[PDB]
Amino acid sequence: AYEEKRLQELKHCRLAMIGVFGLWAQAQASGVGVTEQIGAALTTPDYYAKAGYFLP
Amino acid sequence: MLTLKILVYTTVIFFVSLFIFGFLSSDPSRNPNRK
Amino acid sequence: TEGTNEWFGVDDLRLLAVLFLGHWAILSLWLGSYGDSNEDEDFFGEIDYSAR
Amino acid sequence: KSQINELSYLQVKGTGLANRCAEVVGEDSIKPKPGAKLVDMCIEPKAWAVEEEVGKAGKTEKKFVNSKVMTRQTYTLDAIEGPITVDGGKITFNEKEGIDYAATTVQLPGGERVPFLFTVKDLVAKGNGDTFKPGFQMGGDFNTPSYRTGLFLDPKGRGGTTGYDMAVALPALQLGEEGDAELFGENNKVFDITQGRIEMEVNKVNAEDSEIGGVFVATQLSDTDMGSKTPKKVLTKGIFYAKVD
Amino acid sequence: MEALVYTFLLIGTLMVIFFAVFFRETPRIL
Amino acid sequence: MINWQVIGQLMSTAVIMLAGPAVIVLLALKKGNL
Amino acid sequence: VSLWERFCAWITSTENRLYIGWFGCLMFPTLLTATSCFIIAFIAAPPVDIDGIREPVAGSLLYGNNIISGAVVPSSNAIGMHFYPIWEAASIDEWLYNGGPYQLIVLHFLLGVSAYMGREWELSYRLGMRPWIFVAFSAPVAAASAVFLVYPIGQGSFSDGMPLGISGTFNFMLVFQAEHNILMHPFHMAGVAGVFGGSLFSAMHGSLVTSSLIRETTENESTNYGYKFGQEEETYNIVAAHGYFGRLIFQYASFNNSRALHFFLALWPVVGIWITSMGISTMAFNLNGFNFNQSVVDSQGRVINTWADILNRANLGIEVMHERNAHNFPLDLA
Amino acid sequence: RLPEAYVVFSPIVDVLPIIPVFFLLLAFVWQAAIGFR
Amino acid sequence: MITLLVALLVLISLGLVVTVPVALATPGEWEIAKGKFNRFFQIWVFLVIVIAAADGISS
Amino acid sequence: LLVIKAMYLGGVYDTWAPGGGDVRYITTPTLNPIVIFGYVFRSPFGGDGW
Amino acid sequence: SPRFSVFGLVGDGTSYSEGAAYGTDQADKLYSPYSVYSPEGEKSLYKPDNAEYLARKKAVLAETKNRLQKIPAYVDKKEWFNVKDELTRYMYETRGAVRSLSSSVTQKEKAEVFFRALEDTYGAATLKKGDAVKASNDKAIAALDAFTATL
């Protein structure tokens, strides 16, 4: 189980190297942080937001 | 109204997930030839 | 409001909670039979008769 | 309201906002000009009560019983316009155009459904004073047209200006000298126009938008079904909004 | 009052269908 | 004014829906892999 | 040995009295929901404003109907194709006024009868049968989905769905003829050939088997006691039935193959009902039946009427009288 | 209308969409010519 | 000139519609006659390009 | 290819275009996944229309 | 003995119910065999050179600037629906009238500049960008007068 932890470390090493490259490249390309780019894309736009729930 | 909607949504997702994971439960093998 | 464009009719987060909790409950039972199942065990038929 | 005009049609539709009146912000005063005219008067009922004899604890007084609307969100009048006439002392309003009627059906306890044309048609409404104030009171009579027009056919094909004038499924009732005189009230479809009374009361005035808004209370009679049933008195309350120019 | 007869005939028909399914004569070989 | 549209349509119909059976008739005469 | 596997073994068990299966996990809750709501709405439901014009139509037995006239009335025309569950209705009385029970019953019935079809596949798989009994049941399922779902979708309102009643069904048929001329549609003609032929072939095949039964009984007992359940031998002389029907018409027009004959018994009504289900589904989008009105014209130019024109005069009588207060404009485009 | 260099072939173009129906019929001729075997 | 070339392309295509499947479905003729059939394929493909040239030049 | 046709190679016919319906380069396509998958996960019924 | 017409070849042909007489019934040449109309040559009553057709297009171009100039009065308010409706209610006839008046090659490229600014006004109105509507509305006006100042 120690060599599985070594393989879990190495596969996370190779994955997060690709991941931190994308974080560094998106922070340049957007100008903001990643919660601030994902959170703006995982939200509905302000012109698209339904007024909503005016039924008594 | 919206208490009934919770109850129906709970009921529908219960029976639909029984349908989904039941047909994922190695269902081709449940035939009288083998297994 | 019924003509508004909500994902799966979810207008309150109560309904999102019971959708997750309902689907994860049968998933957890189903993982009692098909969790701890080996990923590298293949077969060359049209149908597999692996285990229970 | 300025808020409602910020939205798209696609943001409002389905939500129920389109059946609501605008709320007015502020206590100000507007003095109407000689050419003044209310333009987009919204009148939204928020309570419905039908008069019926009830058996409370030991007696049988007449009570306005609260009833539930079954015609869903189609009840609010809107785009009501008409000139504001300044008399010697008082200020009056004569409505002319707009969606000044809404067919509403309420249900009484017991299952009794009471359809009525909620209307302000031909309203001449007298006020107290000369300016619109947060204590201003406008009120007057209006004409309630019949809920069904003379073109309406009943289940047997009888109406006022069209249709059969006999119970055509019972042809042997047209026999003898008396004929179908026992069925006269159902065969004679009568267009009836009754009177209603609304009492508006301004409590919020926005002078920069030239908008007034307050509450009302109105009473009228319900559908007679072309003179076949006795109508019931329907009391309604709610909110109004208008712009003064 | 005839809706009492209409209800009794329909509910009585469904009770026959219940007994025809769950109290059926089981088909048996030999 | 000899109406060459119906002449053109019915001849081109006849050439086309004979070209298909001509393939199978020729393959039956050639004794091919039908 | 796990809890889910023991539940899976019970669900797919062929030793239950009724097979449940995984389609029964959708079939049994939806159809018992629709059955419970249908019985309550048929017996006791207040009148429904079907045409959206605040003219409520009584459909239940407690509001003065009988078995023939009673119906679960379709939804309001003001609703249209909008989804109207109970929780979108602000009170149950508003839901009952606007024809809410129709949408609940129809959507649970159509889900439940599609799951009834998949249940018919599923038991055949657990029994080792050939699969396609549920393909034959797809023909009445397509017909039920055409008149309850597809024709509302094309016309844009559940108010144009077929009412759940006997007299509402005849109202659905007559208005459909006036607006779409279904009798002159060849897909209804193939459907009539499907049910006339299918009941012909049922009476034909049922005659020739009963005609050629082998002596196994006496004059006192019933003839059906000559068959034992589970016997291996044939119970009727199929050579004698083929020799009869081969002399009734002529020899080359009769099935000697019983497997080809029973396949023809399955195919003729099912394909006929499939085609007429795709007549209703295509008249949903107003691709109507044949219009031969004023097509026969004499030398001066005057119209000579045909039987299609007399059929047209009956279509005109239904359409000027149907939904008599609902129309404000000279064309029924809905 | 077709472009002016090609309006001579306008009757040929009138039969061209029908040719897929002739391909389904061709499979039945070929099966009959082989004798359905 | 375009009308002459398309009329030639129609005639070559009609000859190839009734001779290519005969050459492919008799079990020896394609390998003994495909230089002749590739020659007709190239005259067919070259006719399309010459028509496409003459159509685009005239436009 | 449809995206390339609409954004770069001529555009597509937009019946909603200002000035009248016409061919228009689609310059700002909606990339918000709540809008885009809001069509996939909405109701199929009236008003929604999946 | 009845009137016969095999399609047009044998018999009358010029009879009131013959359907496959493609052009053989009438004297004047048709646009195509599959048409009931004669071509767009002369003898046609529609003259595209005519003064009442040109004046109708110029009246669309003049009133377009009047509708295009009441855009910022909706943008000091926030009636974004009024901006999108103004660009489509009267102005629906603008693209039909501008492309009809754009004959030369510089007219067409000066017309699309007006069209691009018109779509920038619309797209900023859906997005409710207040400064971007007005910055596109003046570009739509300034490209409109540049088109009309040609001819």
Ligand code: CLA
């Ligand atoms: C077999 C079980 C079953 C099913 C399928 C239904 C179905 C329905 N019921 Mg019924 N109901 C049932 C049993 C069932 N019922 C029972 C037992 C009762 C008594 C408690 C009821 C009581 C009841 C009432 C009172 C009402 C309904 C109503 C409804 C309708 C809408 C309900 C809804 O919005 O749920 C919510 C549904 C979901 C959230 C959908 C879940 C489906 C999942 C998300 C699958 C999607 C997969 C996805 C696309 C994959 C993409 C993956 C990819 C992105 C990677 C629907 C037809 C309503 C109705 O009839 O309206 C007219 C209504 O008013 N039901």
Ligand code: CLA
């Ligand atoms: C008087 C007798 C009679 C006859 C001969 C017909 C015949 C027909 N009816 Mg009609 N019909 C009738 C009375 C009749 N009907 C009555 C009393 C009613 C109720 C009022 C109807 C109501 C009705 C409706 C609503 C429709 C028809 C239709 C039809 C057609 C197809 C039905 C079908 O296939 O059935 C099943 C029959 C078979 C499967 C057997 C085939 C019968 C054919 C005709 C025999 C062919 C023999 C052949 C030429 C011989 C070749 C072999 C030879 C060498 C020996 C068919 C032409 C349909 C239609 O209009 O189609 C265009 C249709 O929609 N019928």
Ligand code: CLA
């Ligand atoms: C003699 C003349 C004649 C004949 C033979 C027919 C025959 C037919 N008509 Mg036509 N029609 C006619 C005259 C005729 N018509 C006339 C004169 C008119 C104008 C008024 C019409 C107008 C008309 C319309 C509008 C329609 C028809 C349809 C049909 C078809 C109905 C059968 C069907 O599809 O059921 C199929 C089976 C079902 C629909 C039932 C499905 C069963 C479900 C799946 C399960 C039900 C279970 C149940 C709830 C519980 C069971 C009990 C339980 C205890 C187990 C059939 C081909 C219908 C059609 O073609 O639909 C496709 C149709 O919509 N006709």
Ligand code: CLA
């Ligand atoms: C042999 C190659 C070839 C091809 C494919 C074409 C094709 C074309 N040329 Mg021509 N051209 C050619 C040779 C060719 N030409 C030669 C040798 C000359 C002399 C130098 C010219 C000179 C010429 C001029 C002066 C003009 C053309 C024009 C055209 C276009 C005519 C329609 C049009 O207005 O464009 C509009 C665009 C289209 C109609 C798009 C057509 C393509 C669509 C997407 C269909 C393709 C679908 C797909 C590939 C089919 C499925 C295939 C299969 C895999 C299933 C057309 C795309 C005109 C042009 O280019 O206009 C811009 C034009 O003005 N050509």
Ligand SMILES: CC(C)=CCC/C(C)=C/CC/C(C)=C/CC/C(C)=C/CC/C(C)=C/CC/C(C)=C/CC/C(C)=C/CC/C(C)=C/CC/C(C)=C/CC1=CC(=O)C(C)=C(C)C1=O
């Ligand atoms: C000398 C002078 C003066 C000269 C005058 C000249 C002159 C005399 C002329 C007269 C000629 C004249 C008209 C005579 C011809 C006679 C004639 C045919 C007249 C009748 C007219 C007429 C047009 C008749 C046509 C009607 C007809 C025959 C229709 C039948 C069509 C037909 C093929 C039906 C088959 C349908 C079918 C496939 C059903 C089978 C399906 C089914 C369920 C079968 C059941 C079944 C079948 C089995 O098989 C077996 C085994 C079993 C188990 C079984 O279940």
Ligand SMILES: CCCCCCCCCCCCCCCC(=O)OC[C@H](CO[C@@H]1O[C@H](CS(=O)(=O)O)[C@@H](O)[C@H](O)[C@H]1O)OC(=O)CCCCCCCCCCCCCCC
């Ligand atoms: C001029 C126009 C040209 C048109 C060209 C064709 C257009 C498309 C037509 C499609 C024909 C497809 C042929 C399919 C054959 C097939 O079914 O075999 C299946 C079996 C095999 O036959 C059995 O076959 C067995 C031998 S074997 O299986 O074939 O090897 C044999 O043992 C047995 O006796 C025999 O009965 O056939 C039979 O059982 C008899 C039924 C035949 C019915 C098909 C006729 C068409 C459908 C009927 C009408 C539809 C119902 C709707 C009415 C409302």
Ligand SMILES: CCCCCCCCCCCCCCCC(=O)OC[C@H](COP(=O)(O)OC[C@@H](O)CO)OC(=O)CCCCCCCCCCCCCCC
């Ligand atoms: C929740 C969001 C997380 C998602 C992150 C998105 C990043 C995606 C991963 C990128 C790098 C992965 C390496 C991590 C390292 C890691 O641990 O990964 C592990 C993963 C699978 O390896 P495992 O050992 O986990 O198991 C793989 C199997 O053998 C099953 O056991 O490898 C990949 O998926 C790498 C694929 C590279 C693909 C890149 C090539 C793409 C180029 C286009 C190809 C052209 C095709 C045309 C044919 C010529």
Ligand SMILES: CC(=O)O[C@H]1CC(C)(C)C(=C=C/C(C)=C/C=C/C(C)=C/C=C/C=C(C)/C=C/C=C(\C)C(=O)C[C@@]23O[C@]2(C)C[C@@H](O)CC3(C)C)[C@](C)(O)C1
């Ligand atoms: C004895 C002692 O003293 O110590 C011991 C015990 C102790 C403490 C337990 C230790 C340990 C174990 C440790 C420290 C384990 C790991 C810790 C860590 C921190 C592991 C991160 C992995 C991140 C990954 C794979 C990111 C992928 C990200 C990818 C692929 C992206 O796309 C990036 C992303 O931004 C974008 C581009 C797009 C978005 O759509 C998605 C997101 C937002 C994700 C020690 C030190 O080892 C030893």
Ligand SMILES: CC1=C(/C=C/C(C)=C/C=C/C(C)=C/C=C/C=C(C)/C=C/C=C(C)/C=C/C2=C(C)CCCC2(C)C)C(C)(C)CCC1
């Ligand atoms: C594009 C083009 C082209 C091409 C085309 C082609 C040519 C195609 C082909 C075609 C084809 C592809 C054809 C086919 C045909 C077929 C047919 C015509 C068939 C039919 C038949 C019948 C129908 C009969 C049948 C039968 C038999 C045989 C026996 C049994 C019975 C029955 C009856 C079934 C060309 C060159 C012109 C040139 C121009 C352009």
Ligand code: OEX
């Ligand atoms: O809903 Mn049942 O019927 Ca179809 O058309 Mn329009 O809408 Mn109403 O009228 Mn006619």
